[PDB]
Design a protein around this ligand. Structure first.
Ligand SMILES: C[C@@H]1CCCCCCCOc2cc(cc(C(=O)N(C)C)c2)C(=O)N[C@H]([C@@H](O)CO)C1
Length: 369
């Protein structure tokens, strides 16, 4: 029954992927950003220069006030609002209606994006990071509790942009080859363990704890591949070395300045592939996902921003990593699956890949404590 959900995501490049939802009775239609990096369902509920529409609680007969405030801070942006519940549906999702917690956004700072076309956020991570505390049941938890929807969803993000959120299962027509699974280390963010990193086939040869300092997560609501400082410096050094044929402004490597080439002449071959090895399902076993330069040079002649950046809160496998892969958030089995997507990245001599099995010893040592 998943065909109805294929292509149910839209977006603008670097501005997030959103799905259409309705809230309230009679249904009010809103576009909702899909965020695996948070756990609150929230919608604009008051005028804002960047909102073309918003939730009007007064017009919904099923709205209930919870008489509690809430604020959610993100890496970029924050908002505050009023908690309540209402009936919610997903037109190009399962044919169900659930009563869900909703934060009505009344004030915000650097959260809404001019021209993004979305008005709210669907936090798909676990209750442990919900605000104000873990007693506020996240939307997907409510969906699973109140309906027969199985406890998993998958995201196919395609690189103006589109994709699919398959709610309740896996659509096998959306990927090729095999799915490779990595354990969800802890149910808060979608936390995973990276056990090895290679650039153009050369191991970065860092203590693998550095890759997960202080966590590694999969976040559809972040654009970039974000790496801890020490890992970021090693990777940039290696990427600079591979592309030293051409020289780039020092601000290019920091994400500030874009770089351009005559349309159709981008020198893809001078930028390396990056392989992230993830902890596998059996003892001493890993697999790798390989990322092409067409993913981490984000298009904005042909002009691009460097979409690998530094983090002080751990690795973030953002949208440019997820794009081109079919990603299964298998909550029921506490694992995340990766496969090559039907909308994969096309290089003439290279290809994005999900490959295994690999043997990797002492993978438990790669987790940060
Ligand atoms: C607020 C987000 C949803 C609206 C924005 C979606 C489009 C922009 C995605 O690009 C970024 C988003 C976030 C952080 C960065 C970043 O690396 N820097 C240095 C600011 C870039 C961010 O905070 N993402 C969060 C949530 O997923 C993590 O907390 C969700």
């Amino acid at each position: 029954s998943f065909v109805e959900m294929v292509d149910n995501l839209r977006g603008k490049s670097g501005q997030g992927y959103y799905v259409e939802m309705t809230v309230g009775s009679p249904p009010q239609t809103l576009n909702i950003l899909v965020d695996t990096g948070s756990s609150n369902f929230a919608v604009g509920a008051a005028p804002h220069p960047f909102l073309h529409r918003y939730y009007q609680r007064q017009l919904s007969s099923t709205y209930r006030d919870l008489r509690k405030g809430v604020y959610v801070p993100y890496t970029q942006g924050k908002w505050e609002g009023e908690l309540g519940t209402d009936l919610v549906s997903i037109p190009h999702g399962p044919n169900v209606t659930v009563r869900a917690n909703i934060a009505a956004i009344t004030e915000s700072d650097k959260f809404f994006i001019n021209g993004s076309n979305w008005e709210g956020i669907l936090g798909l991570a676990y209750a442990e990071i919900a605000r104000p505390d873990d007693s506020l049941e996240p939307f997907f938890d409510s969906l699973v509790k109140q309906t027969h929807v199985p406890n998993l969803f998958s995201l196919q993000l395609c690189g103006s942009v589109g994709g699919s959120m398959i709610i309740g299962g896996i659509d096998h027509s959306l990927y090729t080859g095999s799915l490779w699974y990595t354990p969800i280390r802890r149910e808060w963010y979608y936390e995973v363990i990276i056990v090895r990193v290679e650039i153009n086939g050369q191991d970065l040869k860092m203590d693998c704890k550095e890759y997960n300092y202080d966590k590694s997560i999969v976040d559809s609501g972040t654009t970039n591949l974000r790496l801890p400082k020490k890992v970021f410096e090693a990777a940039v050094k290696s990427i600079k070395a591979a592309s030293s044929t051409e020289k780039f402004p020092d601000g290019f490597w920091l994400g500030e300045q874009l770089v351009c080439w005559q349309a159709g002449t981008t020198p893809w071959n001078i930028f390396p592939v990056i392989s992230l090895y993830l902890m596998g399902e059996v003892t001493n076993q890993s697999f790798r996902i390989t990322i092409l330069p067409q993913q981490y040079l984000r298009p904005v002649d042909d002009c691009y921003k460097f979409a690998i950046s530094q983090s002080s809160t751990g690795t973030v496998m953002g949208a440019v990593i997820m794009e081109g892969f079919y990603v299964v958030f298998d909550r029921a089995r506490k694992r995340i699956g990766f496969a090559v997507s039907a909308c994969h990245v096309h290089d003439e001599f290279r290809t994005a890949a999900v490959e295994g099995p690999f043997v990797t010893l002492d993978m438990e040592d790669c987790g940060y404590n």
